[PDB]
Amino acid sequence: SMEQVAMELRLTELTRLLRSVLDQLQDKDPARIFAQPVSLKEVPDYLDHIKHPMDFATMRKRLEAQGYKNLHEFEEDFDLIIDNCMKYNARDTVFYRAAVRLRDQGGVVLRQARREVDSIG
Numbered sequence: 001s002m003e004q005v006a007m008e009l010r011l012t013e014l015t016r017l018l019r020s021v022l023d024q025l026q027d028k029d030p031a032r033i034f035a036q037p038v039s040l041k042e043v044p045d046y047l048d049h050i051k052h053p054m055d056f057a058t059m060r061k062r063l064e065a066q067g068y069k070n071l072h073e074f075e076e077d078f079d080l081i082i083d084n085c086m087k088y089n090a091r092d093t094v095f096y097r098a099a100v101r102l103r104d105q106g107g108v109v110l111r112q113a114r115r116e117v118d119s120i121g
Contacts, residue, residue: 014117015066018074021113022063025078026056028105033098034081038088049088054080071117075110 037055059077068074082103089095
């Protein structure tokens with residue numbers, strides 16, 4: 001149908017906007033601490049601590065499959081990156097500190113993304 005096509009175009013355009021959001025958020029992690037999944041070879045007990053792992057490569061796979069239906073779902077995954085790190089790692093670590101900076105700096109980017117998604121429908 002023409003309606004299913006129009007909906008597919010809306011999803012494609014959301015995917016385009018979220019791809020730009022993801023790029024901007026990932027620039028706020030210049031050390032690449034959140035780039036890839038925590039290695040279960042190197043942290044073999046991680047899943048005993050963290051039940052829903054997340055990282056920027058995993059978000060990118062979901063994005064490219066158009067697997068985000070709205071900005072809320074995308075923010076949920078970004079928040080897991082931050083929140084998983086801040087639980088697993090102690091406050092006095094480079095990991096925790098990197099998450100705090102990513103959270104603080106990403107808030108700005110996400111604030112305007114919310115407006116652009118509401119604005120452009």
